[PDB]
Each structure stands twice: as structure tokens, then as C-alpha cells.
């Protein structure tokens, strides 16, 4: 059935891929039984975490299996979205349009400033990252996870355009194509463009004000190198998973805002997210209307009907309720700081990729549960529950039940 198939089916690409990489061809140093079902789960969930470093631990075969597995995951979301749209002929366009913008923006635009390492490492490292960037993965080759390209213009400009558009809904992807008018965009598509750009300005401002004097990262960078990080660190928490600067040496306040910035997903159709941006807008702005008086939640003078409100609320509490369970079921499993335990969970459920340095030092007991977190958050809290949820239809109504909550 449509829900269960996506649940147990996407579960197999994890398992099968978890043996496609633990093979002695793709692994140099011994890959323990625990650190193998994990890194193959992160790429298929396009999450951005890994027990072992992908570039040095895995050979050419390993990076290839990771790369192709990510294409499967982005395809799975591409189908996930189409199902949401209607509630066969497009399946050609979406995957063909995938490998199109994935190739022309990688082997052409990402091979411009990376041919330094030669052709054995410049042809590949320019194609591996785009199937991960456009899909909002966070899997980087070199161990620095893009930390080396702090303020290099080609990097901060090419990769951002990949996970942003890949990260916005395939709706707003498809919509701007045939519509192409400044005024004909539908409600959802018009939402994304506004909320996407506008939030990034709040996010670049936040990272720039707090990490301005921080001598660790961004504090003593040049004037131009200071924007390439505040911007990128403001756009990578959107389930992207790339580090322009390190998160384990930032002001405590900056990390806080990221927990929320990474919690809210980006776009419904998107590439991977714990709670899509649209959900956050609706929930929040629907409350803003309550505090005033409008009998209905109207946005852009095109009022949304009531069912969107309850569904957005459901996707909201579910993500929090689960992330809280994670933060709880990890503070005891591993002796780690508290700020890192909360950052890790929000990222794990959002498939965000940004890690404060705890993913390599994850214990075994805390892994099998963390694998479920990215599994649940990637598959989305709604379409995942509908599987093992015995749907129950009520036909008889009941008396009014008074209750106050103020």
C-alpha cells in the first residue's frame, strides 16, 4: 500500500546498500558491523552523518555506491512529492531533469576550480558532491567537509544553488518553469520563494552578528571571507550538511538558532527534511491570526482551508515529540555534553548533516536508535505513521465537551 511500501521498501535500499559498501573492495580499514549499516543509511537518507570519514575510509567503489544511493533517495522523494501533488508520465522528466542539472552544474561548473588534484581526483570530486549537494546530503570527500573552502567564490556559489533549488519543493521547481510569470505562481510556490529567501536574510544576519568576533571561526577572517561563511552557515542548516566553518567552536547562541533553523525543513517536495518550511509558516502564522481576531487563516489574500492547519500541527508536534525522545534516549546512552546531544538530534531527524563532532564518537547502543531517527525524519513523520496506523473511521457523533486551556 502507498504508505507501507515507502516504509519497508525504502528500508531495504538501506540494508542492501549497507552490504554494497561493507564489501572489502569499498573499505580500506576494517568496517565494523555497526559503522556499516550507519553510513549507508545516512547517504540513502541523504542525512549528512557518518561514523567513519567517507573520503579516506572508502575507496572509489565506496564513494560510487554512496553517490548512486543518494540518487535513489532523491528519486524516492521525487516520487514522495508527486504523490502529495495529486492528492507515471512525469517520472521520466524528474529523474532526467535530475541528472541534467546534476551533470551540467557538476562536471562543468564544479570542475572549474577543482581540477587541481588532477583527473583521478578532480573529475570525481567535482561529480560526487553535486549528487550530494543537489540532494541535500552533506557527504563530502576530503575529511574537512568543505571547511577548506571557507571563502572561495566558486564553492559557496555553485553548491548553494544545488541544495537550495533541490531543497525547495519540486512544485516550485516545476512551477517556475511553465508558469514563469511574477504573478501567476500558486499559493504554495509563491510561499516557498518568499519564505526561502526572507529566512536566509534572518539567518545570515544571525550567524554574522554572533560569530563576528568569535576568534575560532569567522572572527578574524577578512571582510569578504566573513560573508562567505555567515551566508553559507546560514543556508547549510537547511538539511544540506556542509561546513564552511566548524560548529564546535561557535557562540552558544548561534548553535541554539541552528537547532530551530535545522529543525524546520525546507520545502515539502524538497530533498529531505524533518518538518518542511511550509509547515512552520502555516503553524506560526495561523497562531498570529489567533492573537488578533481573523476567523480564518488567510495568507496572500488566498485563505487556506482548515485541513491544512491540523495536518501542519500534526507534523509539528510529531517531529518535536520524536526529537525529544532522541535527546532523552541519548543523554544516558553516551557521556557527552548537553548542547551537542540536542544539536545532534535535531540534525539527525532533519537529515541536516551539520554535526558538532559527535557522529564519529557515537556508541553502538546510541546508533541503532539514531539510525531510526534519520530514518523517521527522512521518511517524514506523517507518511511514515500512516503505515502501521490502523485507519479507523468514526460514523457517530458525540456531545460537546467543554474544557479551558488559557
Amino acid at each position: 500500500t502507498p504508505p507501507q511500501v515507502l516504509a519497508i521498501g525504502f528500508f531495504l535500499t538501506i540494508i542492501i546498500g549497507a552490504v554494497l559498501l561493507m564489501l572489502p573492495i569499498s573499505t580500506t580499514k576494517p568496517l565494523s558491523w555497526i559503522d556499516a549499516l550507519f553510513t549507508a543509511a545516512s547517504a540513502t537518507t541523504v542525512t549528512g552523518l557518518a561514523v567513519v570519514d567517507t573520503g579516506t575510509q572508502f575507496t572509489v567503489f565506496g564513494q560510487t555506491v554512496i553517490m548512486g544511493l543518494i540518487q535513489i533517495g532523491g528519486l524516492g522523494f521525487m516520487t514522495f512529492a508527486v504523490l502529495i501533488v495529486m492528492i507515471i508520465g512525469l517520472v521520466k522528466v524528474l529523474f532526467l531533469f535530475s541528472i541534467s542539472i546534476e551533470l551540467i552544474a557538476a562536471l562543468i561548473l564544479s570542475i572549474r576550480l577543482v581540477p587541481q588534484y588532477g583527473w583521478s581526483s578532480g573529475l570525481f570530486a567535482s561529480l560526487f558532491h553535486a549528487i550530494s549537494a543537489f540532494n541535500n546530503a552533506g557527504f563530502s570527500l576530503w575529511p574537512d567537509n568543505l571547511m577548506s573552502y571557507v571563502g572561495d567564490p566558486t564553492v559557496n556559489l555553485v553548491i548553494t544553488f544545488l541544495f537550495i533549488t533541490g531543497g525547495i519543493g519540486f512544485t516550485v521547481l516545476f512551477d517556475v518553469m511553465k508558469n514563469r510569470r511574477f504573478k501567476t505562481f500558486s499559493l504554495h510556490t509563491k510561499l516557498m520563494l518568499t519564505g526561502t529567501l526572507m529566512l536566509n536574510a534572518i539567518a545570515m544576519l544571525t550567524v554574522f552578528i554572533l560569530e563576528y568576533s568569535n576568534p575560532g571561526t569567522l572572527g578574524h577572517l577578512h571582510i569578504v571571507d566573513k560573508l562567505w561563511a555567515s551566508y553559507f552557515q546560514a543556508v547549510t542548516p537547511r538539511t544540506a550538511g556542509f561546513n564552511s566553518l566548524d560548529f564546535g567552536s561557535m557562540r552558544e547562541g548561534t548553535i541554539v538558532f541552528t537547532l530551530l533553523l535545522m529543525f524546520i525543513g525546507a520545502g515539502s517536495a524538497s530533498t529531505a527534511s524533518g518538518i518542511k518550511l511550509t509547515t512552520f509558516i502555516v503553524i506560526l502564522t495561523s497562531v498570529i491570526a489567533y492573537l488578533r481576531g481573523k476567523k480564518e487563516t488567510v495568507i496572500f489574500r488566498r485563505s487556506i482551508k482548515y485541513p491544512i492547519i491540523i495536518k501542519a500541527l500534526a507534523v509539528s508536534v510529531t517531529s518535536l515529540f520524536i526529537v525529544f525522545l532522541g535527546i532523552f534516549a541519548l543523554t544516558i546512552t553516551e557521556q557527552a555534553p548537553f548542547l551537542q546531544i540536542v544539536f545532534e538530534t535535531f540534525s539527525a531527524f532533519g537529515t541536516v548533516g551539520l554535526t558538532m563532532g559527535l557522529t564519529p564518537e557515537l556508541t553502538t547502543a546510541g546508533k541503532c536508535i539514531i539510525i531510526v531517527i534519520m530514518f523517521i525524519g527522512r521518511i517524514g513523520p506523517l507518511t511514515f505513521v500512516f503505515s502501521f496506523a490502523k485507519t479507523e473511521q468514526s460514523n457517530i457523533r458525540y456531545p460537546d465537551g467543554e474544557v479551558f486551556t488559557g
Partner: protein, 268 residues
């Protein structure tokens, strides 16, 4: 000794024919003649008069009657102004048929010796018939009748599955029944999901059109409901409900008149 009934409605017609049955003098009278014609052989004296005119009350020797009954329905002013004139002729006992709650209050300050609610006072009697007839009680249709049985059965202390077509009545009857339910008794799934099968006594008190009343009972008889009690409207409603399997049928307008015609006979 001398009885007089004003207004030959359904209630006022069921007292003229019943008091005449045992053998008591009845001065029947209604506003027009269409009813007074069919009641020419059902009363001691059939008269065509308007109970609001003074000269028609005096010329009828109404003051010789110790018992005057005002059963004029429809417009209340005809009911009120009549008793207002009767209380002026020093009528010993005036009995009036009230319509709503405020009609009870205003008639009480005029000097109305008795006030009868055919739909309400009957429900409390049926709620006594179902109590002394035996556990699971369910009343469909929260009309005036269906509301007076849910209110009474809950007073004695019996479980009542109150249910009406909409919620406006089910709201005010939330603390007046064991289970207040908003449902249409014509839908099968709403009857099954309500566990109505478990109820040995179902009361269809839905008013207004007959099909809602009938179809309900038609479905109830399919669920093998032991005792279905139904509120009928007209004569043909009695016959059709009798052929469906209606265990009991109640006429709030008619059955109340025969009880009042027993209260006036034993009163002297």
C-alpha cells in the same frame, strides 16, 4: 356536572368524544364550522362561535358550566383571551391547553385553574410506562415529546440513549440523558455504531414529517428491536406503523384527551 370544551383541535376533539362516551354533557364549540359539523353527534351541544366575543359566551349560557376547557391551538391569543373572558364570568374551573413555556406563565397569572401540555405531560406518562414495563432505553427525536421522556426517565434514574437529528437539542440534553447522541435514525451505520441493537426499548419521537418517523422504526424492526414505541401523527400514520411491526404507538394529542376526560368525570 355541566362540561364545556372550547376549540375542537386534536386535543379538544379527543375530550368531547370521550366525555360523551361515558355519558357526560359536553358543550363543544370551535371557531369555525368545519369541525363543529363532524362533532354534531359527539357532544351534548355543538356550537359554532368565537370564544373572544363576549355576547357569544353569554348567549351560550357558559357560566352555568363549572368546567370550561380551552383547547384552541395555533394562535395563542385566541387561547389566552378566551380564558381571560372565562375568568370574568366567574367560571369555577377553567382548564387550558398551553403551547410553550411562557404560555404557562401568562395563563397562570390570568387565573387559569389548570394548564395541560399534551406533548410534555404525555412524555412523563410514557416515561412511567417504560419504567414499570420492566433496562436499555433509547429515545429518537428530541421533540417536545421526545424531550419530556429523556428528561423524566433520567429523573427516575434510568439509562436513556437520547438522540435527535441535529445537535441543537442534543446540546441542551447533554446532562439530561445517559448518552446524548447526534445522529439521523434513517442511516443504518448510525444505528449499528450506536449499539442500538442492545436497546430493548426504542422511542421514535421525531416530529414534523412522517418518513423520518417511519423509516426509523422500519430500520429498528430490522435490528430485531424487542419493543419499538413510536410517536404517530395522523390516522394513516397509525395504520402504516401497525403493519411495520411497531410494538407501541402513542398519540400525544389524542391519548391525552381521553385521560383529561377521565380527570373531569371523576372530579364530580
Amino acid at each position: 356536572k355541566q362540561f364545556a370544551v372550547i376549540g375542537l383541535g386534536r386535543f379538544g376533539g379527543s375530550i368531547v368524544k370521550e366525555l360523551h362516551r361515558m355519558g357526560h354533557e359536553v358543550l363543544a364549540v370551535d371557531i369555525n364550522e368545519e369541525k363543529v359539523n363532524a362533532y354534531a353527534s359527539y357532544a351534548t351541544h355543538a356550537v359554532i362561535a368565537n370564544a373572544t366575543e363576549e355576547n357569544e359566551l353569554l348567549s351560550l349560557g357558559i357560566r352555568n358550566f363549572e368546567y370550561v376547557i380551552v383547547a384552541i391551538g395555533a394562535n395563542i391569543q385566541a387561547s389566552t383571551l378566551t380564558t381571560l373572558l372565562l375568568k370574568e364570568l366567574d367560571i369555577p374551573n377553567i382548564w387550558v391547553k398551553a403551547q410553550n413555556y411562557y404560555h404557562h406563565k401568562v395563563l397562570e397569572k390570568i387565573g387559569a385553574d389548570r394548564i395541560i401540555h399534551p406533548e410534555k405531560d404525555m412524555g412523563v406518562k410514557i416515561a412511567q410506562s417504560l419504567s414499570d414495563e420492566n433496562k436499555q432505553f433509547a429515545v429518537i427525536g428530541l421533540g417536545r415529546f421526545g424531550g419530556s421522556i429523556v428528561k423524566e426517565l433520567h429523573r427516575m434514574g434510568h439509562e436513556v440513549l437520547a438522540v435527535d437529528i441535529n445537535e441543537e437539542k442534543v446540546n441542551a440534553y447533554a446532562s439530561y440523558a445517559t448518552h446524548a447522541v447526534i445522529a439521523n435514525a434513517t442511516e443504518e451505520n448510525e444505528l449499528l455504531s450506536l449499539g442500538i441493537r442492545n436497546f430493548e426499548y426504542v422511542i421514535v419521537a421525531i416530529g414534523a414529517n412522517i418518513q423520518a418517523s417511519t423509516l426509523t422504526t422500519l430500520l429498528l424492526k430490522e435490528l430485531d428491536i424487542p419493543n419499538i414505541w413510536v410517536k404517530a401523527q395522523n390516522y394513516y400514520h397509525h395504520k402504516v406503523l401497525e403493519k411495520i411491526g411497531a410494538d407501541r404507538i402513542i398519540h400525544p394529542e389524542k391519548d391525552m384527551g381521553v385521560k383529561i376526560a377521565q380527570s373531569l368525570s371523576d372530579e364530580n
